């Protein structure tokens, strides 16, 4: 963690997404992009949110460890952690079958950090709001910036 | 060859990204509304450009012409200036949905007591697929990291 | 678990001990014997004690899972769990240096169930009261029982 | 050979575990106080046993003698009975700490109009190392599981 940014492409249920995790001073940022449809979700989580979230699972983690787990899962560099991406409808079925949708919730995606060790099987859910498609202006506005820095060197 | 100029310029109350690029035997002119991200694009050959300049009265050779257009975009010459206007705006100076959309980049050349107007037709491309734009943003970001 | 009894010999810090774990209906029993000096400690723990004990560690386990972990550690059949045996003096130093003894506490041993997985490092402590040396009568009384059952078959 | 008898019996207000075992050319007698776990043990050869029985008056051959002692422990004969008493109790019928401790298993043989008293000296072993006893308990428990 400590200022670092990890971004990788990965396929969730037969679709390429761009995933960007960024650990900053007392804030974790997750950003996902549908690379085919350019749809986007983003989440911001504080150390309190995160730690209190893991406590709910009975399997606590401290904020830096969690971010480190997440980094590891994005990097696919650790067999004990894995990701998944779900919709609220999907999310209920895997907990409702175990035993009414607003605009913001309906488009929401849940990034599920999945922790598997010899005696625990834990799912840590990170809720990501639908952020819309981006503005093709600003993308171009921004591409015109990168083009010049590239030519500078 | 391959020389590229990119500059920002205003055309009748709006901001445009103008990119001109001279390949061998091909002039490429792209125009984007920096705000609405509307894009227009022309590709012109030597034969076309020389045929065009004569038609208007003051023929220039293709390299010389591109060169002027490069100066115009650098705003680095008095003899040349640019305008941008529609088939309606052009009609008055002298329509299908395609025509209603396309733009004309005018190279306004000054000599002696008169000004010559060189119209380049630039077709409409549409707005871009922002997916496509992000994939390309991803590529440029990886060029910078390694470098 | 569910009625089962596991007993094995194992060396803690250069001494052979006999360890006996027994999982019964809502009660876990741990019994340790110094095989050279015949000293003995025993502990009985309920599902509430155990579960509330794991919660304290931030890394919950349900009673049957914990007993199963413990069985696994005694059986040395799982790389993620290991045992250790400590005295209260030992126990403090590893937590006091990280930053007055009654009879019953002084002779007490702590069986430390040690859980190591990719992102957690947990020590689960089971306190065992010193039960004295056994009565050589009852041992003999009992050996005279086994001798006859053996000859019966 | 190898025949073993184990029975419980009372001797002057106390409970004892008596084990008698006839190997070839050796009689083994062990006695344990089932309560205090005090243990006494004798090992007697044929020559010793025959020399002993004559001394007392009514010689028996070694196999015959052991056999009687086995009957005595099974309490399965009228002619024989057992007692257990100390060098002090024995003196009266006719001391270093070792002697003060040791016991005598008496085989009381009845014939015609008299009773013959056969004393076997059984040394003190001490109480046992309960460590040792547990190690042995562990061994027997593993014999039973497999079987």
Author numbering:
A (entry chain B), C (entry chain B): 2 to 100, 110 to 163
B (entry chain A), D (entry chain A): 3 to 96, 111 to 163
Describing publication, verbatim:
The highly conserved coiled-coil domain-containing protein 61 (CCDC61, also known as variable flagellar number 3, VFL3) is one of these understudied proteins. Here, we identify CCDC61 as a highly conserved paralog of SAS6, a key organizer of the central scaffold around which centrioles are formed (Leidel et al., 2005). Our crystal structures of CCDC61 demonstrate that it adopts a SAS6-like fold and forms oligomers through two homodimerization domains in a similar way to SAS6: an N-terminal globular head and a parallel coiled-coil domain. Further analysis of CCDC61 reveals that its coiled-coil domains are capable of directly interacting with microtubules.
To find out whether CCDC61 can form a ring in a similar manner to SAS6, we determined the crystal structure of zebrafish CCDC61 (residues 1–170; zCCDC611−170), which contains both its head and parts of its coiled-coil domain, by X-ray crystallography at a resolution of 2.9 Å. In the crystal, zCCDC611−170 formed a homo-tetramer mediated by the head-to-head and the coiled-coil dimer interactions in an arrangement that would not be compatible with the assembly of a ring. A filament model of zCCDC611−170 suggests that CCDC61 would be able to form protofilaments with a left-handed 3-fold screw axis along the filament, the helical rise of which is ∼80 Å. However, instead of the spiral/ring assemblies observed with SAS6, CCDC61 assembles into linear filaments with 3-fold, left-handed screw axes in vitro. To further confirm higher-order oligomer formation of zCCDC611−170 in solution, we subjected this construct, as well as its F129E/D130A mutant that disrupts the head-to-head interaction in zCCDC61, to size-exclusion chromatography with multi-angle light scattering analysis. In this experiment, the His6-lipoyl domain tag of each construct was retained to stabilize the corresponding proteins at high concentrations. The results shown in Figure 2D demonstrate that the wild-type, but not the head-to-head dimerization-deficient mutant, was able to form higher-order oligomers beyond the coiled-coil-mediated dimer. Comparison of the structures of zCCDC61, SAS6 (Leishmania major [lmSAS6]), and Caenorhabditis elegans (ceSAS6) and human XRCC4/XLF by superposition of their head domains showed that the difference between the exact higher-order assemblies formed by these proteins originates from (1) altered relative orientation angles between their head domains and (2) altered relative orientation angles between the head and coiled-coil domains. Intriguingly, in the filaments formed by CCDC61 in vitro, the distance between the projecting coiled-coil domains of CCDC61 that point in the same direction is about 24 nm, which corresponds to three times the 8-nm repeat of tubulin dimers in microtubules. This periodicity might facilitate microtubule interaction by the CCDC61 coiled-coil domain.
